[PDB]
Symmetry: C3
Subunit: 315 residues, 3 copies
C-alpha cells in the first residue's frame, strides 16, 4: 500500500507572476485527492500551508522576496518532515519551484540518503550571485548542494538552510533553457543531467534507465521527484510561468513517473509551477491541470497498460 | 500485385454515439478507392453491408444492442470470408470496433492460422460480465479468444460465434486506457502487448520488430490488422468516440502499417471508430479522415521514402 | 571561434508561391544577426543579393523560370565562394530551395571535398525531364550530382553549372513526399537517406550517428547543411510552400543541428523555404520564423543543455 501526505503550498514569491499560488486549489478542485483514492492509495491531506504575509521584504542585492521565500520553505520543510515521520510519501502542491528548498530539506531530515530526480526545463541552480533575474524559483538547487555552500551568501530568510544533497545525488531531466552560470556549475560539479538533447539522442527509456541506475546503482534509497510542469512541452502545460518549447511529451512525462513509481522508492514528490492565471484560454488551464494530475497519478501507480486489484476478475 | 476487397460496415450499435456509421461514407468520399488505385492496387469494392434494423433489442443484463451488434458481425464475417475466398485482402471500413468480431471471424474461416495485430488505445477485451459500460465495441476480443470461451455467456445475437484465436495469436499496440478486468485477462492469459509505456520505452521500431517476430517467428501466416483510429493520438484522429491523450503519433501510425505492409502478409484490415459527427470542427473531421486514409494507404504500399514502378525513370 | 558569412537570397522563382523571397527580411527582423552575436559568433553580413528581374523567361519545356532561377544560383554561387574564401561559414537565407544549386556549387569551389546533409520533406532531386511540376526548387540536387550529368538537358540559365558532388557525398534526412522518378534515382544511385520511416525506426540519435559516420567516416571534410524548413513538421514551420504532415520535430530539428555543430565541420548552411505570406495567422509566421532562427542558432553553438564562456562563474 502507498500512503500519501498531501501538502498545499500556495506560494508565488519565488517568481514575479502571481496565480501560481492557486496551484493547490485548481489541482484539488480537479479531483486529485479523490482520484488518488480511486486507486490503492491511502491519502492524508495536511491542508494548505498558511504562508504569513511578510510586507517588509526588500531585495537582497537583486534577489527578490528573500524573507518571504525563505520562510515559506522553512515552513514547508517542517511540514514535509512531519509527513515523512508519519511514514507517508510527501506530495507538495505548489506554488513556485523555490519551495523545493523546503520540500527537499524537510525530506532529507527524515531521509538524508535521498536521491533527487529533477524534471524541469531549467536547472534552477543559480546562486544569489549568478542569478540575473533575482527570482528564487531559479535558485533552489544552489541552496541545497553541499558543494555550493560557501558560494551562497547569507540571504535573509535562509539562515535555517543547510545543504543536504551532493552534486552526485541529483539527476536533471528535460533541460532546454540553462543560464551560463548554471551550465558552469553543471560541468564543474559533474552533475548528472539529461537535457532535451540527451532525451532525443537516447530516448526516454534509456534516459530513465540511466537515471535510476545512476541514483540507485550502488544501493537503494528514497527518491525525491521535484517535477516542474514547465519541464513538459508547453503544448501540454501552457499555464506556467516560464514555458519553453521543445519539451518532454505527455507520454515521456508519464513514462518518467511510471518508471519512478515502479522503483517503489518514491519518497517525496513536488508538483510545481502550475499557474492557472497564465492560461490564454480556460482550456489551457484545464489542459495544464489535467496533465499535472496525470503525472501525479502515475507517480502513485496509475499505469497506461492498466491496473487491477489482487482479485480474479473472471471468477 | 495486391488485390483489395473493400467492405463498408456502417454500424454504430456497439457503442452509444451515432455518426460512426458514416465512416465508410466519409472515407470513400475522401478518395480512398481512387487513391488505392493510384498505387499498384487491384481494388474491388463490395459496397456497404446493409445492416437491417433490429427494433427489438433490449439489453442482455447490461450489454447494449446485442442482437444488432451480433447480427452485423455475423453479416460481416460472411462478407469477409467471401472476399478472402476471392483471394483479396479484406478492407473493412467501420463502423464501431464491435465489428472486429465478424471481421476476424470471417477472416479466420478462410485463414485459421491468422495472427492479429490490434492497434487501439483500448484492449476491447471486456467480457459481457466484466464490462461496466455494456458497449460491445469494448468487448470484441473476448468473443474471439478460445481461452475465454466459457466466460462468455450466451448473449442474444452471438450464437454463431466460435472463438478462433488464442491469446498467443494477438498483439496489442498503443494501449493507454485499459479496464481493471481487461488488465487481469491480459496478465492472466499472457497476452503480448505494447502499451504506450512500452512504445515510449522501446521506440516504435523495436515495438514493431518484436510484434512481427512474436507473431511470425515460428512461421509465416496471414496477418489481420484491426486498427482503431483512437489508437492514434487525438491530435491526429479527434473525430472518434473514445479518444485518449498520449496516443501513437501520425508517424508511428504510418510506421506500424509500413512495416506490416513490408511483411507481405497483410491479409485482413479494419479501419474502425471514425465518427465524423464527433469532430468539433470541419477540420477535425478532415484531419481524422485524412489520417485514416494515410494509414490505410501505407498498409497497401505507400512508403514515405517513396515508391516507383518497375521502370527506368531516367531512360 | 566561429565566423559567419550571412547571405540574403530573396528569390522565389524556383516555385510558384511568392513571399518566400521575404525570408531574409523576416529572419533578420527576428534578430538573427544579433542573436548570433549574442553567442561566440563573429558575424559578417554580406547583405541581400540583388536578383535582377529577368522579364523574358518562358518555360523550357515545362521547367518554369529557368533563366531567373539559373541566374540567381549563379550569383549566389559566386557570393558563397567569396564568403568561403574569407574563411567564413556561409549562411544563406532563402528564398526557395532552388538556390541550393548556387549555394552548394559556390561552396564546392572553395571546398570540393564537401559533404552535404539535406534536411527536407522532399529529395528535390527531380531532373528537368522527370519533374512534373516544372518547379526548380524540386530539382536542385539533380543539377549537382555528377552521376546525373547527361540526364540533365541544357536548360537556359544553367550553362555555368558543373556537377560537384557524387551520390555518395550526400545524406537526406526527413523525407516523406518523394516523387516516383526521384525514388528511382535514390535506389539507382545508392543515395544514403533517412526518410521519416528510418527516423521512426532508428530514432534521431542513431540517424545522426549514421549520417556523420557515413559522411565523415573515411575522413573529415567540410559539411554543407541544406535545411528546408518544410523538413520539420508543419506544426513548427507552417509558413512554407510545400508542407507535409508527419515531419521532424522541433526537438529532432535541434538535435540534427546540435550534432552537426558538434562536429566542428559545418562549412555551409542554407535556411530555405520560409514564406511569411503562407502563414494562416500572424502566429504561424512567428512560429515558423522562430523555429528557423532556433535551428540556425543551434548550428552555430546554441546547446539546449546550456552554454558558458571560458570563465569561472563562481569565482
Ligand atoms: N525557474 C525559472 C528559472 C529561470 C531563470 N534561469 C532564472 O534563474 O530566473 C531565467 F529566468 F534566467
Ligand atoms: N472501445 C472502447 C472501450 C472502452 C471501455 N473499455 C468499454 O469497455 O466500454 C470503457 F468505456 F470502459
Ligand atoms: N521542393 C518541392 C518539391 C516538390 C515536388 N517534388 C516537385 O518536384 O515539384 C512535387 F511538387 F512534385
Ligand atoms: Mn522550469
Ligand atoms: Mn523549476
Ligand atoms: Mn479504442
Ligand atoms: Mn477499439
Ligand atoms: Mn521541401
Ligand atoms: Mn527543399
Amino acid at each position: 500500500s502507498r500512503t500519501i501526505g498531501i501538502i498545499g503550498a500556495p506560494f508565488s514569491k519565488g517568481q514575479p507572476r502571481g496565480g501560481v499560488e492557486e496551484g493547490p486549489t485548481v489541482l484539488r478542485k480537479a479531483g486529485l485527492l479523490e482520484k488518488l483514492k480511486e486507486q490503492e492509495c491511502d491519502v492524508k491531506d495536511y491542508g494548505d500551508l498558511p504562508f504569513a504575509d511578510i510586507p517588509n521584504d526588500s531585495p537582497f542585492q537583486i534577489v527578490k522576496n528573500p524573507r518571504s521565500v525563505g520562510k515559506a520553505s522553512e515552513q514547508l520543510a517542517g511540514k514535509v518532515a512531519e509527513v515523512k515521520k508519519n511514514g507517508r510519501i510527501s506530495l507538495v502542491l505548489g506554488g513556485d519551484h523555490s519551495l523545493a528548498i523546503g520540500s527537499i530539506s524537510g525530506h532529507a531530515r527524515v531521509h538524508p540518503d535521498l536521491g533527487v530526480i529533477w524534471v524541469d526545463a531549467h536547472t534552477d541552480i543559480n546562486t544569489p550571485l549568478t542569478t540575473t533575474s533575482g527570482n528564487l524559483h531559479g535558485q533552489p538547487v544552489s541552496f541545497l548542494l553541499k558543494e555550493l555552500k560557501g558560494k551562497i551568501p547569507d540571504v535573509p530568510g535562509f539562515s535555517w538552510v543547510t545543504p543536504c544533497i551532493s552534486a552526485k545525488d541529483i539527476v536533471y531531466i528535460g533541460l532546454r533553457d540553462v543560464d551560463p552560470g548554471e551550465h558552469y556549475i553543471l560541468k564543474t560539479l559533474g552533475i548528472k543531467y539529461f537535457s532535451m538533447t540527451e532525451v532525443d539522442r537516447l530516448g526516454i527509456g534509456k534516459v530513465m534507465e540511466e537515471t535510476l541506475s545512476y541514483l540507485l546503482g550502488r544501493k537503494k534509497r528514497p527518491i525525491h521527484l521535484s517535477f516542474d510542469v514547465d519541464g513538459l512541452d508547453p503544448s501540454f502545460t501552457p499555464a506556467t510561468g516560464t514555458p519553453v518549447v521543445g519539451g518532454l511529451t505527455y507520454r515521456e512525462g508519464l513514462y518518467i513517473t511510471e518508471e519512478i513509481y515502479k522503483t517503489g522508492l518514491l519518497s517525496g514528490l513536488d508538483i510545481m509551477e502550475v499557474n492557472p492565471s497564465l492560461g490564454k484560454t480556460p482550456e489551457e488551464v484545464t489542459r495544464t491541470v489535467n496533465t499535472a494530475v496525470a503525472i501525479t497519478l502515475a507517480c502513485f501507480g496509475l499505469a497506461r497498460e492498466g491496473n487491477h486489484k489482487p482479485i480474479d476478475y473472471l471468477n
